[PDB]
Structures are given as structure tokens and as C-alpha cells.
């Protein structure tokens, strides 16, 4: 996260850390959507250009964390994968279209002050809040600059009008994507960066004051560059696939 802030304790109880076993290392962001299901970006597990393709056994889930490197005794819970589910049409060859994946845990995690699932939006929540200028919040333990943070970082960023998004880049942008960030004209700045991948773009419903995951941290060109924006997987658009997988694998 660049030009973000330390998270408060209990700020993102759904934040999840994708951690590599050997060598022990942060792999990606991710999120808690149920006591057995974590949401992340497909590229966290599979990116052939970088010989990236993880198996369930290669990884661990770390829920309830605040400190990046510490083992937060009596607070964080660390879990194991029973199966990885990647979107069948994730486009890693061209533009990372449908950059989405599910991870089912071995046993359920227990909820706490620090551990709690975020909601997934209904069509109506999305129509209401996925509006240019409305802001979301991104969190992660990624790069501070296009360096490493001590604790979870947070930024609020305005959603950006689709033309602007498209005009910022040469990549073919899709409806399964949205971009977010300040314009270079707006003054403030901030962005997700390397290591924030799979983390959540979240918004708080002013209709029922619940927190909704609208986006997943997916890609960008550099971090916090003027007139560049963060791109996020459109979670509602792929929501049918999410309930399918969950409905199909209990």
C-alpha cells in the first residue's frame, strides 16, 4: 500500500494473509468470507509467466493478523488448504480478466475480535455503491513504495469512471474490472502495490452499515503513479461463480 496508514486494531477482521511455508514468506492478500472460505486473486496461485502455480500444500492461511512478520500468539489463527478453486476463464495470458480464486480451509476458523467475515454484495448493493467518486478502502501488507510495513496498511480511494480507467492504460480493460485511485488533479494520492495482491477493496453500506467486498487487488502499472490507477476484480460480476463453487463443494 503506498501513501496509506497503519490499520487500527480490529479494522479489517476479514483480512487474510497468504503465507508461504518454505521459504516462510508473505505471498498475497486474501479475505475471510465464511468460517471455511477465503477469497483471493487468481494470480496469487497461478501466473505461468512467472512459473507461479501453487498447490494447497504449499501454502498457509493466516487470519486475524496485524503485524506483518510477527507470529501474533493468542490472536492470529493459521490455517491449511483442503482445495484451491480458480476461475475457469481467468485470463492470465492477456489481461488478468476474472482474476479470482477460492480457498477452502481444512477446518473452520474461530471468529474473534480480530477475525470476522466480510459480506459479498447483492446486485442492489453493487448498483448502489459502485459509482465513480464513491470511495472504498484497500488494505494489505504490501510494498510502501513502487519499503516493507511493520503493520497492516490502509487507504481510502475513490472509484474512477470507466473511460478514465481505459484511457489510463493500453491494456484491454473489461467489465469484470474496475479501477480506483485519485487523479493527479485531485491532490491526495495512495495505491495498492506489489504484495497487496488478492487483498480486499471494501465499502461500507450506508443502508445497513455493513462492510462489503466490492473488489480484489489485481493489477496496476507501477504503484501510485500520476494518472495511473489500481485495477480490482469486480466481485459482484463473478459472484455467480462464487456461489456455484461454494454451493458445489459445501
Amino acid at each position: 500500500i503506498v501513501e496509506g496508514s497503519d490499520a487500527e486494531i480490529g479494522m479489517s477482521p476479514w483480512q487474510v494473509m497468504l503465507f508461504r511455508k518454505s521459504p516462510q514468506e508473505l505471498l498475497c492478500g486474501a479475505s475471510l468470507i465464511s468460517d471455511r472460505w477465503v477469497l483471493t486473486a487468481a494470480h496469487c496461485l497461478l501466473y505461468p509467466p512467472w512459473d507461479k502455480n501453487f498447490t494447497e500444500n504449499d501454502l498457509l492461511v493466516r487470519i486475524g493478523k496485524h503485524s506483518r512478520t510477527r507470529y501474533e500468539r493468542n490472536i492470529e489463527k493459521i490455517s491449511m488448504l483442503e482445495k484451491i478453486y480458480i476461475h475457469p476463464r481467468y485470463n492470465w495470458r492477456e489481461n488478468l480478466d476474472r482474476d479470482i480464486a477460492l480457498m477452502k480451509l481444512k477446518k473452520p476458523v474461530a471468529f474473534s475480535d480480530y477475525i470476522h467475515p466480510v459480506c459479498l454484495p447483492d446486485r442492489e448493493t453493487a448498483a448502489s455503491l459502485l459509482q465513480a467518486g464513491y470511495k472504498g478502502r484497500v488494505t494489505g501488507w504490501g510494498n510502501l513504495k513502487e519499503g516493507q510495513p511493520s503493520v497492516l496498511q490502509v487507504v481510502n480511494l475513490p472509484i474512477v469512471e470507466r473511460p478514465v480507467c481505459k484511457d489510463s492504460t493500453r491494456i484491454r480493460i473489461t467489465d469484470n474490472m474496475f479501477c480506483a485511485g485519485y487523479k493527479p488533479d485531485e491532490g491526495k494520492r495512495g495505491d495498492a502495490c506489489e504484495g497487496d495482491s488478492g487483498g480486499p477493496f471494501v465499502m461500507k453500506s450506508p443502508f445497513n452499515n455493513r462492510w462489503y467486498q466490492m473488489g480484489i487487488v489485481s493489477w496496476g502499472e507501477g504503484c501510485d503513479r500520476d494518472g495511473k490507477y489500481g485495477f480490482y476484480t469486480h466481485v459482484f460480476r463473478l459472484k455467480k461463480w462464487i456461489q456455484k463453487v461454494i454451493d458445489q463443494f459445501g
Binding site: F19, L60, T69, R70, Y71, I78
Partner: peptide, 10 residues
């Protein structure tokens, strides 16, 4: 960089 996770998690 990372503190020792308990080997119970492997």
C-alpha cells in the same frame, strides 16, 4: 524477515 511460525502448522 518473518518470525518463526509454530511448526505445528508445518
Amino acid at each position: 524477515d518473518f518470525e518463526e511460525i509454530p511448526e505445528e502448522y508445518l
